[PDB]
A paper describes a structure:
α-Amino-3-hydroxy-5-methyl-4-isoxazolepropionic acid ([name])–type glutamate receptors (AMPARs) are the most abundant ionotropic glutamate receptors. AMPARs form tetrameric cation channels that are composed of GluA1–GluA4 subunits, of which [name] is the most abundant. Changes in the trafficking of α-amino-3-hydroxy-5-methyl-4-isoxazolepropionic acid ([name])–type glutamate receptors (AMPARs) play an essential role in synaptic plasticity, which is the cellular basis of learning and memory. Herein, we report on PFQX1(AF488), a fluorescent probe for the visualization of cell-surface AMPARs without any genetic manipulation to neurons.
Therefore, we used a ligand-binding core moiety of the [name] LBD, termed [name], for the x-ray crystal structural analysis. The structure of [name] bound to PFQX1(AF488) was determined at 1.82 Å. In the structure, PFQX1(AF488) was recognized over a large area of the aperture of [name]. Specifically, the aromatic group of PFQX was stacked with Tyr68 (Tyr450 in full-length [name]). The two carbonyl groups of PFQX, which mimic the α-carboxyl group of glutamate, formed hydrogen bonds with Arg103 (Arg485) and Thr98 (Thr480). In contrast to the PFQX part, the AF488 fluorophore part of PFQX1(AF488) was located at the vestibule of the binding cleft of [name]. In addition, the phenyl group of AF488 was situated at the hydrophobic region surrounded by Leu145 (Leu650) and Thr180 (Thr685). The main-chain amide group and the side chain of Thr181 (Thr686) formed a hydrogen bond with the carbonyl group of the amide group of the AF488 part. Of note, the negatively charged sulfonate group of AF488 interacted with the side chain of Arg179 (Arg684). Therefore, the x-ray structural analysis clearly revealed the molecular basis for the increased affinity of PFQX1(AF488) bearing an anionic fluorophore for AMPARs.
Numbering used by the authors: 10 to 268
The structure:
Amino acid sequence: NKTVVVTTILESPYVMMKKNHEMLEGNERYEGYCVDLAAEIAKHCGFKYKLTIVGDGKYGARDADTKIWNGMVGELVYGKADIAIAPLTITLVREEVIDFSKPFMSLGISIMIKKGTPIESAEDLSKQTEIAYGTLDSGSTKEFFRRSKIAVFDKMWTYMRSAEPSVFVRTTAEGVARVRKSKGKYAYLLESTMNEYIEQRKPCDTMKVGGNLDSKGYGIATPKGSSLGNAVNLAVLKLNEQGLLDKLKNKWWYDKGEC
Ligand SMILES: N=c1ccc2c(-c3ccc(C(=O)NCc4ccn(-c5cc6c(cc5C(F)(F)F)[nH]c(=O)c(=O)n6CC(=O)O)c4)cc3C(=O)O)c3ccc(N)c(S(=O)(=O)O)c3oc-2c1S(=O)(=O)O
């Protein structure tokens, strides 16, 4: 039997380098939620596996000009990996070209504030202009606002699209720094999972407020028609029912949190 090639992505806390990684080999180089999850999936499915970091560092999209899938999705579609174990969002266009398990983690768009900011909901943000707010320039959150027909989110998009200086940031680190350094006058819109992670990072000055604005899930992906997909999906369901997915989330977000 052959070693399963698992594509994954360097993204904290899902996959992170061990400090001594230069003196380590194979799967021992990495730690994180998806490292632990890969070991559990492999245990339940009965395979040996090698974690490999996706070469282009991307989740996966179809290039608008060439029509070629990149990222982990592309690794699956073009025969370079057997399974993707990563926070890969289950979307329509991806589901058409690869197979997904049921989701192992659910999430939604959410609001990050500096502690003390008088905001508790998206509606609160939308009905004022003293506190600026934005999102990742390249993110799925931006696209949610662009396409939304809900009055509150439409108003928020109209504000964000034309706000000056730009309220959009190039990276999560830029967004978080802007929240922390703006003295409560900038709020940041992002995935609840990342928001919750940052809430547990020093110096513990940010928090997540309000309910999620949408709902989506991260799934395990296999090439379309792969015989591995059935067992992997049953594994995700068993791990959820055993409490193990919740245990892993608690471990990497809270037991290992700094706040
Ligand atoms: N200098 C730079 C520097 C960075 C540039 C980036 C860039 C931006 C931001 C970040 C960053 O904050 N990462 C942390 C983060 C925040 C949210 N997630 C997340 C996203 C998922 C996902 C799971 C998660 C997680 F983790 F929450 F679970 N699962 C999916 O299934 C999925 O799909 N997504 C995407 C989505 O949901 O959105 C992760 C990292 C990068 C990067 O270096 O890869 C860049 C990206 C796209 C793009 N088209 C272009 S660009 O074309 O070049 O403009 C980009 O450019 C960049 C230039 S740049 O080129 O010089 O202008």
